[PDB]
Amino acid sequence: VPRGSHMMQSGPVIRVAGDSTAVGEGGRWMKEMVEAWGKKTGTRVEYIDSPADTNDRLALYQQYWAARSPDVDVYMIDVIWPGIVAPHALDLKPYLTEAELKEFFPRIVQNNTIRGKLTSLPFFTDAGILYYRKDLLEKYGYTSPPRTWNELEQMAERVMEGERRAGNRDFWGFVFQGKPYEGLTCDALEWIYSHGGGRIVEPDGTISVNNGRAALALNRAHGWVGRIAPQGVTSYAEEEARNVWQQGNSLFMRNWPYAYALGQAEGSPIRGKFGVTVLPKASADAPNAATLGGWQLMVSAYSRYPKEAVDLVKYLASYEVQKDNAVRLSRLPTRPALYTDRDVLARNPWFRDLLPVFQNAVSAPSDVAGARYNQVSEAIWTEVHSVLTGRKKGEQAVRDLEARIRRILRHHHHHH
Numbered sequence: 347v348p349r350g351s352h353m354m355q356s357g358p359v360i361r362v363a364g365d366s367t368a369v370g371e372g373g374r375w376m377k378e379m380v381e382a383w384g385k386k387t388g389t390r391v392e393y394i395d396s397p398a399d400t401n402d403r404l405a406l407y408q409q410y411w412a413a414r415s416p417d418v419d420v421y422m423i424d425v426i427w428p429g430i431v432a433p434h435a436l437d438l439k440p441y442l443t444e445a446e447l448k449e450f451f452p453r454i455v456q457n458n459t460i461r462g463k464l465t466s467l468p469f470f471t472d473a474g475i476l477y478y479r480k481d482l483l484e485k486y487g488y489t490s491p492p493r494t495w496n497e498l499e500q501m502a503e504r505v506m507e508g509e510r511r512a513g514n515r516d517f518w519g520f521v522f523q524g525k526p527y528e529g530l531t532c533d534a535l536e537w538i539y540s541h542g543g544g545r546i547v548e549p550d551g552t553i554s555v556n557n558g559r560a561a562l563a564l565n566r567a568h569g570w571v572g573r574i575a576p577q578g579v580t581s582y583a584e585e586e587a588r589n590v591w592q593q594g595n596s597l598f599m600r601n602w603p604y605a606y607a608l609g610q611a612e613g614s615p616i617r618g619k620f621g622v623t624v625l626p627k628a629s630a631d632a633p634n635a636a637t638l639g640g641w642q643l644m645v646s647a648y649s650r651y652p653k654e655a656v657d658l659v660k661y662l663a664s665y666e667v668q669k670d671n672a673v674r675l676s677r678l679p680t681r682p683a684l685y686t687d688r689d690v691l692a693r694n695p696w697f698r699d700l701l702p703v704f705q706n707a708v709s710a711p712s713d714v715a716g717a718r719y720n721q722v723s724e725a726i727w728t729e730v731h732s733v734l735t736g737r738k739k740g741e742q743a744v745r746d747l748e749a750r751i752r753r754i755l756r757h758h759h760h761h762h
Contacts, residue, residue: 358651359390360658362420363407366395375675376422376662383661389654400424407431414648419655420662421644426719428458428465428642429712435465436645441656442467449665450680453707456549458642460713467663468680470671471640473707474536474625475700477591477599477606481619482509495540495566495626498598502574505597514595519574521587522600526731529583531710531723532637533600534730537563539635539708540627546726547711547751556748559628564733564740571734580734592616600625602639603678606696624702634706640680672697680704718754725750 347353362380365373377393384391397403404427410418411434423431442464447455454468478491486505492498502519509517523529539545543560547553554560571579576590584601591599592608594615599605609616627634643662645655661667665684671677672690678700684690685701715722729747732738738746 355390357390358654359392360384360419360651360654361392361394361417362422362658363394363396363418364420364422366398367393368395369398372675372677375671379662379667379670380658383658387657389658391658394418396422410646411648416646416648416650419646419649419651420659421646422469423466423642423644425457425638425640425642426710426712428460429714429716429719431644432460432463432465434644434647435463436647436649436652436656438464438467438645438656438659441653441660446660449683450663451682451704451707453704453709454638454640454680457638457707457709457713466642466644467659469641469643469663470668470677471638471680471704471707472603472678473636473638473640473700473703474532474600475603475622475636475703476625477601477609477620477622479505479597479616479619480621482597491621491623492598492626493630495628498626499570499574502597506574516593516595518576518590518596520570520598520600521575521579521582521590521596523583523587524571524575524579524731524734525581525583525586526727527583528723528727530727530730534564534567534726535637535708535710536600536625536635537567540625540632541566542628542632545708545711546747547714547722547755549713551714551755553748553751553755555751556744560744561740563628564730564743567730568733568736568740571736580731594619603700607676622696622699624706634702635708636703636706638707638709640678678704715755721754722751725754 364376367373367377373395380391380393397406407421450468454471458464458466482505486508488501492501506517506519523533535546538560541559541563543557543563544554546555571577587599587601588605590596592614606622609620624634625636643659645652645659649655665681668679668681669684669690672679672684673693676694685697691698711722712719725747729743733740733743
């Protein structure tokens with residue numbers, strides 16, 4: 347076969363579908379890392395811009411997976427996607443030693459493990475956290491943020507009485523996401539799990555929510571509505587909550603981490619006045635909780651170069667690449683060691699406060715629900731929202747919610 351520029355060059359070409367280089371800096375950075383890996387290893391690489399919209403990205407990836415296409419080796423997948431994409435993922439478990447796997451938060455490794463397959467490595471993350479006004483806590487004699495829900499409610503009532511007396515009729519104690527949508531599922535998982543009430547649906551498939559601790563969790567949350575939280579909280583998603591908070595009108599907020607940098611912006615009324623920590627829990631013997639978000643890296647089951655693709659994924663999820671992502675882009679690492687890295691904390695000191703968040707991360711039940719996740723989530727947010735609006739109590743809601751999820755997850759073919 348003759349040589350010439352138009353003839354085939356031998357050798358692998360490793361193709362990554364990552365964040366888009368057209369939108370913001372995340373995709374430009376990710377492509378820079380892929381190209382760096384290619385240069386350091388002598389491996390040709392190509393980069394595919396993925397949609398920023400999660401549903402559009404999933405659709406794009408499904409065009410490849412439907413065909414068992416070899417044309418992407420590495421995909422960047424959402425936290426709830428392992429549960430639906432596992433058959434399209436190479437099992438990474440044989441390629442990682444225990445020492446290597448243990449460097450990641452175990453709850454995020456668990457999220458990515460579906461019927462024993464390690465579908466993907468943790469890349470960067472997000473979870474539900476507590477925002478608190480440190481100025482106001484100091485003013486009212488508190489030296490640390492609340493560790494329990496009762497403390498939260500006590501502090502909220504004291505600070506609300508003092509700020510309303512001083513004349514701010516718009517001031518509240520707590521804002522969160524109470525609207526009947528996906529975000530309520532995430533708030534509710536935190537409430538229930540942090541009361542010792544379980545994970546709604548357990549990783550082994552047990553529908554555990556009909557229990558006394560879960561019921562209290564929900565009744566407690568109803569007890570906030572119109573009292574330490576606005577009556578309108580039952581219509582709030584993430585940005586309605588952030589609006590009240592960022593105006594200076596809430597002592598506490600539950601939200602995702604994106605609100606932190608927005609609150610520190612030049613014109614923000616609350617710039618320099620807040621901290622973050624893990625959400626409270628019912629008592630010291632209960633566990634903490636933070637509903638898990640974020641992104642993972644999968645090697646395609648259809649890759650023609652699985653070993654090389656794995657090498658690239660391990661590199662992208664490595665200590666130094668995650669560190670670069672944290673220092674340059676403020677992405678939250680999936681390695682606990684980075685939360686005490688002196689260079690990460692010099693750039694992002696508040697990251698330290700998130701270590702207990704990710705040590706206590708819990709996932710929505712996408713592992714077990716598969717193609718029926720949205721049905722299960724809708725059941726959860728509907729029943730929980732029924733409690734927040736006073737239309738039913740927690741005991742009935744958790745009973746009704748168990749029944750709803752059982753119907754959704756039941757095998758079609760019954761046998762009497």
